[PDB]
Design a protein around this ligand. Structure first.
Ligand SMILES: [K+]
Length: 1123
């Protein structure tokens, strides 16, 4: 409003500049240019040594259409510059940078943002002190302000505590030089999805909303693909203006020059979405981006009308990691009390002994028991408060999931706490016991750091005990906090005091009620504010069970009167339902002071508990059943030996509780109350129970019946088969698993030896359905009429009845549990219930970055993880079924249960290194000749290979139709950049090729988990591995499109990519458009699959398991089709 920059943000989208760093690399500067060898590479020193070079880059961006340029001052901080011996030059280099930008900006009417980066040292991990970090930002911001920047920009924030430190430092520099400007703060979200130190986007925005920041936003780390979700969050929720400056995606080496593939036109489309859909206010580029990126962005967003920002932000608190709302719906905001020195005894002794692992474990307990935040008080009689805090707080900063309520009478101790604790904190003591000047101290501290304040109702003349007092004190404090200090009502939590009403004393017994009555009046009079109570103090001086109940009831009553938070022992808080009826009634009589003549509620409440008052306390029979159903590994072997000592025979133990459990699991799975991963968890408990009882039995029985299970010849790792093995074995039966790639010779060899009820055949691949026919054709000659059970994703239910002519007894199995039902009926444990348009010419031939084939190693797995089809993973692979559930209810199920597994598996795979993404990829000059695609050499021009792609029957569609014919007249420049010899030979098109692999490691790891009987982790690890390999193919296809110059036609939503929402298509050998696997040997010769550790078999199958190749087609009308 006041400042021109914020006026401009209201009127139009402001286009920021792109990268300074990458633009300097083009100029090929020398140590002389940086003013010495020591200073070489420091861009900020160029403000001194070569201003004209910095000026020129600003001009290039201004001309392109940036209305805002950033000063070349990112690392103009003491501790950053120290690496170059320039620690003393921060204010100078900041100033000169700001003066260079000012000179470039003034003719163009453009804004200048005083950019300061996050530095090289993280405050939250104690790599730099608050005071040191504070000084560096204050120094460099005075320089920026003196050079005439129109805003201060805190860029690339990794540490949310640095954001608070830098905001305060910068605001004080403004005070010193007597000039305010708007403050823009931009965080950086890693591809993992949080800031580097751990802060998610909810925590980051909660922190920023409490501080005096005019524009919040995002830059660097990722391209716009991964930013989308984060920038959507900021745009939708932030009351401030929103900025967004993505990278040009992941970098790529190209002859020792670092190259980025995100084009101007793609960036433009992303920023158009961010401005037009989400209402982002400023947009620019970060690493990789140049003037051309800015040019296209400006063109895209010019003219668009800004959306107005939300008026309000929900009141919420934040730790280093996560946000928590102060208003908890229905419930309360529970603050754990047990990290108090005076209160808790266990904490007190742990603090004195310096038992960190004890204190953190205690803090975990409170969180598990349902604390939303934790109270912290270390103020003991004698001890140095500051010194105990200095020891403890660095560990709490990074250890704690939940935020902290700093409970201290000392403002010095509070200020110290605020310098260690990241996020948005609460402060406990804001009261007028020692006059205004110590109340105002804590308030200004809460306002400056953006903390939520607990406003305790204690004035100069003693405490507030009655209703009238509690009200009058609270209104005086509310007036002070709002009008003087400027704190919002939502920031305040008023503690109307909570006095003890027990101990047998009168005067104490009507005070719990005057709190409740005052709470009502202030709820109505002061809307917006919160209400906290030290709830455990009402029952101070009472037996353990008695205090538990009275506390629970006073909590509930306070809630009804308007309580929004409470300091409690969350573990002990009872729902009033579970309090017995007499106790509840007496607790209320006590609270509200309902003395009849022959009745004291304190006596009767006390008297009640005198002479009154896990699944381990169950029957031994039923406990072993629920061990299976609930999937409880711990205490199985302990309970089994207890059963054996009571003379329970192993067979009737297995057939009794344990098979009863797996039956209940089969029923719950049918009813959709239990999903597949948890069913496998039950099967583990069963397999552990069998394995314990195997040495303690003489039976060695055949079970319900035998089954010879196997996977067909020329197939691959069939998890589906192994799930049959798991489910059947642990439902009583005896499977013999023959493995994969078994021919019909050795499968029937098992049949004569074992002599089974049924013979299971299975196959993942589509081509092994015809190999199953050949198996059944082989069997009828020898005269076999055993009931064969066919299954797999390859087969269909109609096809087994059509195959029933060849073999009489053949049955389908959709999943493992149909295969179970089948085996029940055969063995006799159940009744027999089962007894094309033509292709127009391409508008261009897109120019690739190179011809030939390259290798790309070490692609960021978090970037790849973005392109996972989570629907395919969670529903398909992991078996979180959709049927009998809504589409928003299923999204809740997976975000609860599946998504944490994924996050864990991603973190594991990155740390432990068991996904190794490699990519073999390239472009070849090609041409159609008839019904063939000729692949010409980039060097010689000779025809290296020829592909006869199948055409659809009845003169239909073919892959060759997407390619230009030999000797065609060029559509444009092709002669200038096609390989000279190939072009003379008649090549007139380009074909992309790609082979991606995650390596052999995830296959080994999956097999080892199945071999160890960790069935659930086998399911998870296998599924994750498949879809991460598909994600790498999806990701790389996007990279191929980007470097080809066609990715501006991609969808800006990821699920649209999975529905081919992009130009062209990729095609793998096996797909119905090209089902001949033999062509993969042609692609091996062109590319050289050994270069990324991929091998092609005799049967033209790729090894290892997690590997896929594809032809990549640029043609806009290219779509998936079938012959
Ligand atoms: K920039």
């Amino acid at each position: 409003k006041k400042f021109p920059y914020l006026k401009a943000l209201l009127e139009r989208p402001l286009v920021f500049d792109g990268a300074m760093g990458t633009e300097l690399q083009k100029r090929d500067l020398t140590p002389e240019d940086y003013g010495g060898e020591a200073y070489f590479g420091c861009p900020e020193v160029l403000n001194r040594t070569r201003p004209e070079v910095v000026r020129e880059i600003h001009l290039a961006y201004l001309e392109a259409g940036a209305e805002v340029i950033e000063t070349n001052t990112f690392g103009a901080l003491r501790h950053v510059l120290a690496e170059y011996g320039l620690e003393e030059a921060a204010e100078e280099l900041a100033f000169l940078g700001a003066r260079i930008a000012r000179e470039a900006a003034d003719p163009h009417g453009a804004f200048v943002a005083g950019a300061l980066g996050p530095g090289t040292k993280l405050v939250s991990l104690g790599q730099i002190s608050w005071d040191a970090l504070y000084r560096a930002y204050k120094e460099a911001a005075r320089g920026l302000l003196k050079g005439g920047v129109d805003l201060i920009l805190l860029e690339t924030a990794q540490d949310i505590l640095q954001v608070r430190c830098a905001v305060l430092a910068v605001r004080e520099a403004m005070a010193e030089v007597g000039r305010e400007v708007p403050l823009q703060v931009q965080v950086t979200f890693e591809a993992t999805g949080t800031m580097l130190v751990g802060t998610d986007e909810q925590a980051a925005l909660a922190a920023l909303e409490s501080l005096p920041v005019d524009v919040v936003g995002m830059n660097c780390a990722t391209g716009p693909d991964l930013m989308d979700s984060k920038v959507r969050y900021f745009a939708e929720h932030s009351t401030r203006f929103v900025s967004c400056l993505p990278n040009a995606g992941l970098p790529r080496n190209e002859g020792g020059r670092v190259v980025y593939d995100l084009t101007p036109e793609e960036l433009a489309k992303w920023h158009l979405k961010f401005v037009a859909e989400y209402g982002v206010n400023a947009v620019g580029g970060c690493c990789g981006t140049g003037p051309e990126h800015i040019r296209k962005v400006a063109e895209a967003v010019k003219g668009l009308a800004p959306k107005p920002r939300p008026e309000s932000f929900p009141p919420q608190v934040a730790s280093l990691y996560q946000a928590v709302s102060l208003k908890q719906e229905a419930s309360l905001f529970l603050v754990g009390e047990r990290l108090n020195a005076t209160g808790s005894k266990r904490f007190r002794e742990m603090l004195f002994a310096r038992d960190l692992e004890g204190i953190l474990a205690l803090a975990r307990e409170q969180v598990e028991e349902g604390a939303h935040a934790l109270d912290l008080s270390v103020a003991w009689t004698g001890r140095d408060e500051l010194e105990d805090l200095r020891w403890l707080l660095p560990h709490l900063a990074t250890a704690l999931t939940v935020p902290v309520m700093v409970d201290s009478t000392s403002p010095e101790a509070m200020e110290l706490a605020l310098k260690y604790l990241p996020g948005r904190v609460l402060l406990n003591s804001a009261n007028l016991e020692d006059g205004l000047e110590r109340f105002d101290r804590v308030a200004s501290l809460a306002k400056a750091h953006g903390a939520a304040l607990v406003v305790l109702a204690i004035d100069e003349k003693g405490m507030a005990k009655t209703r009238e007092e509690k009200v009058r004190v609270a209104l005086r404090m509310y007036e002070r906090l709002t009008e003087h200090h400027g704190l919002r009502p939502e920031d305040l939590l008023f503690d109307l005091l909570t006095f003890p009403i027990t101990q047998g004393d009168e005067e104490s017994r009507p005070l719990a009620k005057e709190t409740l009555l005052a709470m009502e009046e202030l709820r109505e009079r002061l809307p917006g504010v919160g209400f906290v109570l030290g709830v455990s103090n009402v029952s101070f001086g009472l037996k353990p069970r008695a205090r538990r109940v009275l506390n629970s009831v006073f909590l509930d009553e306070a809630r009804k009167r308007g309580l929004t938070a409470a300091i409690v022992d969350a573990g002990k808080i009872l729902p009033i339902s579970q309090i017995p009826e007499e106790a509840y009634a007496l607790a209320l009589d006590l609270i509200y002071d309902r003395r009849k003549e022959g009745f004291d509620p304190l006596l009767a409440f006390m008297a009640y508990f005198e002479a009154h008052k896990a699944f381990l306390a169950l029957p031994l029979l039923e406990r072993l059943k629920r061990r299976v159903v609930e999937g409880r590994k711990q205490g199985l072997e302990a309970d089994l030996e207890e059963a054996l000592k009571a003379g329970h025979k192993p067979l009737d133990l297995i057939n009794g509780p344990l098979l009863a459990g797996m039956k209940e699991v089969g029923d719950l799975f049918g009813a959709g109350k239990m999903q597949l991963p948890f069913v496998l968890q039950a099967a583990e408990v069963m397999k552990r129970a069998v394995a314990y009882l195997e040495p303690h039995m003489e039976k060695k029985g055949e079970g319900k019946g035998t089954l010879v299970l196997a996977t067909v010849k020329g197939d691959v790792h069939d998890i589906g088969k192994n799930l049959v093995d798991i489910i059947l074995s642990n439902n009583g039966y005896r499977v013999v698993n023959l493995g994969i790639k078994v021919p019909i010779e050795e499968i029937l060899k098992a049949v004569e030896a074992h002599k089974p009820h049924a013979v299971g055949m299975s196959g993942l691949l589509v081509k092994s359905t015809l190999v199953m026919k050949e198996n059944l054709e082989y069997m009828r000659d020898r005269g076999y009429t055993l009931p064969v059970i066919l299954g797999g994703a390859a087969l269909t239910r109609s096809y087994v009845e059509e195959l029933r002519a060849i073999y009489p007894n053949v049955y389908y199995a959709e999943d493992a549990f149909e295969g179970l039902r089948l085996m029940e009926e055969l063995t006799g444990h159940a009744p027999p219930e089962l007894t094309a348009r033509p292709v127009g010419e391409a508008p261009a031939v897109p120019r690739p970055p190179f011809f030939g084939v390259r290798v790309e190693e070490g692609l960021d797995l978090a970037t790849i993880a973005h392109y996972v089809n989570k629907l395919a993973l969670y529903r398909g692979q992991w078996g979180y079924s959709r049927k009998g559930l809504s589409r928003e209810a299923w999204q809740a199920l997976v975000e609860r249960e599946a998504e944490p597994v994924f996050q864990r598996l991603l973190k594991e795979a990155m740390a432990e290194g068991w996904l190794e993404p490699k990519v073999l990829y390239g472009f070849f000059p090609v041409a159609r000749e008839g019904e063939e695609l000729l692949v010409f050499s980039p060097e010689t021009g000779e025809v290296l290979e020829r592909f006869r792609f199948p055409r659809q029957k009845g003169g239909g569609l073919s892959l060759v139709d997407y390619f230009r014919p030999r000797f065609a007249a060029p559509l444009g420049d092709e002669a200038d950049w096609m390989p000279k010899e190939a072009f003379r030979a008649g090549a007139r098109d380009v074909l992309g090729v790609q082979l991606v692999t995650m390596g052999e490691a995830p296959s080994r790891k999956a097999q080892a988990l199945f071999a160890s009987g960790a069935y659930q982790d086998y399911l998870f690890v296998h599924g994750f591995s498949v879809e991460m390999t598909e994600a790498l193919a999806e990701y790389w296809h996007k990279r191929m499109r980007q470097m080809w110059g066609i990715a501006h036609q991609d969808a800006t939503e990821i699920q649209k990519l999975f529905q081919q929402g992009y130009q062209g298509a990729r095609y793998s050998f096996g797909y119905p458009a090209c089902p001949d696997l033999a062509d993969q040997a042609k692609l091996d010769r062109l590319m050289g699959f050994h270069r990324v550790g991929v091998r092609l078999t005799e049967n033209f199958q790729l090894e290892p398991e997690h590997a896929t190749s594809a032809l990549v087609v640029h043609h806009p009308e290219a779509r998936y089709f079938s012959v």
